[PDB]
Amino acid sequence: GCGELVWVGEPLTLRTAETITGKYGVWMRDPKPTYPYTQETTWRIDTVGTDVRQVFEYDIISQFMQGYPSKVHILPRPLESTGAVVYSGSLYFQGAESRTVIRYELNTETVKAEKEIPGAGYHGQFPYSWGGYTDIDLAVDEAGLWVIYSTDEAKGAIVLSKLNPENLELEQTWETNIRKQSVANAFIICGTLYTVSSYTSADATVNFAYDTGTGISKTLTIPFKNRYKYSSMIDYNPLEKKLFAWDNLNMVTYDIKLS
Ligand SMILES: [Ca+2]
Ligand code: NA
């Protein structure tokens, strides 16, 4: 059941990092789970620092919320920032100090594909408003895998491209009029890109939308609360139909409603 985003619920805290290494990070589930994982499997990456390689994996939700990881993967190359996603058995992440997206198959711990995002800024050229080298933000929605970025040709406006999940080729590209560094983060629901106005405010909003199906841009005023005042990661999971976010040590989730 697709539709336009009309409401975001209150953030629910599922886990809190215990060290500064997890001030920012990304946590995620696979909306297209594949053996040996399930819809309960959760991954967590604490992303502070310069040689981020540890990916914590939890087989079931209770372990993610209360226990130790069931497995730790050591990535073969350091990861950049908070934009990564898991999709159909692979972690898609950006190589540190690069515009390269890497497909890392989790079960086999194998790199299956790598792609430079053509023309994408990286390492602080088109971050979201908080910085954090957030130039490249992967996304999964009801239609599959996407990447959110910008380029010099787009003058820093958000660009989004649909990606082939097997080989990382770009399938189609859209250019918005939204300055990427003017918004706190972004995510895609049902082919519409949404942005969040602030990473600090308890009274932020989902403030812009761009519908890739119609080409129409809109302003919105949907309330969005940063409970802990520093949201470094905001993504959408189309299986759960929820937002997943990382806010100042806290892994949080928001319910949503679509028209
Ligand atoms: Ca995002
Ligand atoms: Na992302």
Write the DSSP assignment of 229-241 as a string of letters: S-EEEEEEETTTT
Q: What is the whole-number distance in angstroms between the Cα of residue 137 and the centre of ligand 2?
A: 4
Which neighbouring-strand residues pair with 12? 253
Q: Is 117 annotated as a binding residue?
A: no
Are the CB atoms for 240 and 9 separated by under 8 Å? no
Q: Is 216 annotated as a binding residue?
A: no
Report the number of distinct structural domains present in the chain.
1
**Whole-number Å distance between alpha carbons of 18 and 36:** 29
**Whole-number Å distance between alpha carbons of 15 and 44:** 10
Q: What is the whole-number distance in angstroms between the Cα of residue 128 and the centre of ligand 2?
A: 12
* SS3 category, 256: strand
State the resolution, in angstroms.
1.4
Q: What is the whole-number distance in angstroms between the Cα of residue 38 and the centre of ligand 1?
A: 22
Residue for token pair 């932020």: 204
**Whole-number Å distance between alpha carbons of 174 and 160:** 5
Instruction: Residue 45: name the closest of 80, 70, 13 by CA.
Output: 80
CA of 199, nearest ligand number = 1
Q: What is the whole-number distance in angstroms between the Cα of residue 235 and the centre of ligand 2?
A: 5
Non-local CB neighbours of 221 within 8 Å, separated by 6+ positions = 205, 207
**Whole-number Å distance between alpha carbons of 83 and 134:** 7
Query: What amino acid occupies position 82?
Result: T
CA of 45, nearest ligand number = 2
Q: To the nearest 10°, report the CA torsion of 209, 211, 214, 219.
A: 0
Give the determination technique. X-ray
Q: What is the whole-number distance in angstroms between the Cα of residue 86 and the centre of ligand 2?
A: 9
CB atoms within 10 A of CB 68: 8
Q: What is the whole-number distance in angstroms between the Cα of residue 34 and the centre of ligand 1?
A: 23
Q: What is the whole-number distance in angstroms between the Cα of residue 147 and the centre of ligand 1?
A: 9
Which neighbouring-strand residues pair with 50? none
DSSP 130: T
Query: Distances from the Cα of 86 to the Cαs of 152, 178, 203, 207, in angstroms?
Result: 28, 26, 30, 26
Q: What is the whole-number distance in angstroms between the Cα of residue 122 and the centre of ligand 1?
A: 15
| Start-end of H helices in 53-121 | 61-66
Are the CB atoms for 201 and 210 separated by under 8 Å? no
Could you tell me the residue range of the domain that residue 78 belongs to?
Answer: 1-259
Q: Is 203 annotated as a binding residue?
A: no
Q: What is the whole-number distance in angstroms between the Cα of residue 153 and the centre of ligand 2?
A: 22
Question: Tokens in use for 6?
Answer: 């009309």
| Phi (first) and psi of residue 124, to 5 degrees | 100, 15
DSSP 44: E
Query: What amino acid occupies position 256?
Result: I
Q: Is 178 annotated as a binding residue?
A: no
CB atoms within 10 A of CB 254: 19
Query: What amino acid occupies position 42?
Result: T
Q: What is the whole-number distance in angstroms between the Cα of residue 138 and the centre of ligand 2?
A: 4
Q: What is the CA radius of gyration of the chain?
A: 17
Sort strands 170-179 and 90-94 into parallel, antiparallel or unpaired: unpaired
**Whole-number Å distance between alpha carbons of 44 and 65:** 11
Strands laid side by side in the 192-196 sheet = 185-189, 192-196, 204-211, 217-224
| Exposure letters 33-57 (e unless 16+ CB within 10 A, then b) | beeebeeebbbbbbbeeeebebbbb
Q: Is 185 annotated as a binding residue?
A: yes
